[PDB]
Design a protein around this ligand. Sequence first.
Ligand code: HEM
Ligand SMILES: O=C(O)CCCCCCCCCCCO
Length: 422
Amino acid sequence: MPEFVETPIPDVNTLALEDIDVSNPFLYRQGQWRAYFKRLRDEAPVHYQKNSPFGPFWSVTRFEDILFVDKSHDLFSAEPQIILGDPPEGLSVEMFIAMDPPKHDVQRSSVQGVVAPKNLKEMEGLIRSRTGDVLDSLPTDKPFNWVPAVSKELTGRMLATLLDFPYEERHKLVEWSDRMAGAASATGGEFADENAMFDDAADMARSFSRLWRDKEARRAAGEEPGFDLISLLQSNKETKDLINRPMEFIGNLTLLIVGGNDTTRNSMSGGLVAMNEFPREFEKLKAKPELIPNMVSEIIRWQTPLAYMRRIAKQDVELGGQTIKKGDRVVMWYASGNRDERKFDNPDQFIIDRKDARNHMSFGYGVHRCMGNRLAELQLRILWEEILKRFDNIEVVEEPERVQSNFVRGYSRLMVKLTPNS
Ligand code: HEM
Ligand SMILES: O=C(O)CCCCCCCCCCCO
């Protein structure tokens, strides 16, 4: 697993169509991703790259084509993986995000109760109060890094709540999730030490087993089950014994924590970046706070926290005037589709009252459409409500540092200065 070392990305018009390689995990940081995807959308909407560090792959970059691919599980498989590359040999974990129907459906239906409306309504007060306390704690006298202070802080707490994982150890959930989703061989991310991946897998399984048993014993001793996933699984006849199917046990708990880890964090960081590029939108918001839910959809579209999901063609498929061969990897570039002017007028503008913001494809479409979508939107809505209660302005004071990945579109440093109300 070689490290990816940053080099300057040239202008896309310097290249031949055939040599456009969008697997490069520095395209987002260097701010080249937009022009690169624009050339793909306009000149090669269904595009084969025969030569990449991850092997050959197709890129699908227009909004309508991505819908078709994502919705067509009869034609494209999500197995065995949904990142572009491969996980390191021997620590593939099976997750339903990378499974086809019918097995996908059974696994998803066994956990979906944790984000049912009535269950999210139970989490709401705790989300609000944490959000409030975090924001109350922030300094207003000087800049600070919003990423660890707010985005990661609130996210780590949410992950712990989802499993009733011991609160004081929540950092481990985030760490385990980062290392899994950031493997160099998978996404071109910064994690290239396979030993730490094996260590984490071992520790996770020890820690999740211990928790499962602890929660069984607590329930038997008469603690009321909570709104978490483990309580939910222990309530249903079908999942009461999930610990004895180790692959589904680890897979489902892992998927749930990875699912809302960097996505929600980067949505939280992202809206401040968008507000800084389009500061009028923040005045519009203060004047019409009822826009928050639509703004949340706009933040998610604009940021597009996951750039893609990957599929394999189950058979030959004609698309965009090209022939995708059975067995070929195909990458649905949501980051491109959400900036497709054929769908969205003024795609690169952040417009918090954009009429069709809700139609973004940041959550995908079809049978793998993000199961946590309402939980993400809930958290974002609450963040901005609580921001509006406290702050007349939120200024980004330094160019953000962006994460190295072809999959995560994220921020590691976001220096912010707050100005309180009165
Ligand atoms: C803004 C935040 C988020 C974004 C952008 C996001 C994005 C996605 C995407 C793109 C998919 C796959 C779509 C496809 O293949 O068609 C997905 C699946 C999933 N997400 Fe999220 N997600 C977010 C938040 C969350 C949260 C908070 C959770 C859980 C607590 C979560 C849990 C899941 C799960 C379980 C799946 C698997 C769905 C399936 O395979 O049926 N996500 N998410
Ligand atoms: O080793 C493996 O199988 C795991 C490597 C792939 C990591 C997949 C990350 C899943 C992202 C889920 C985001 C859903 O909101």
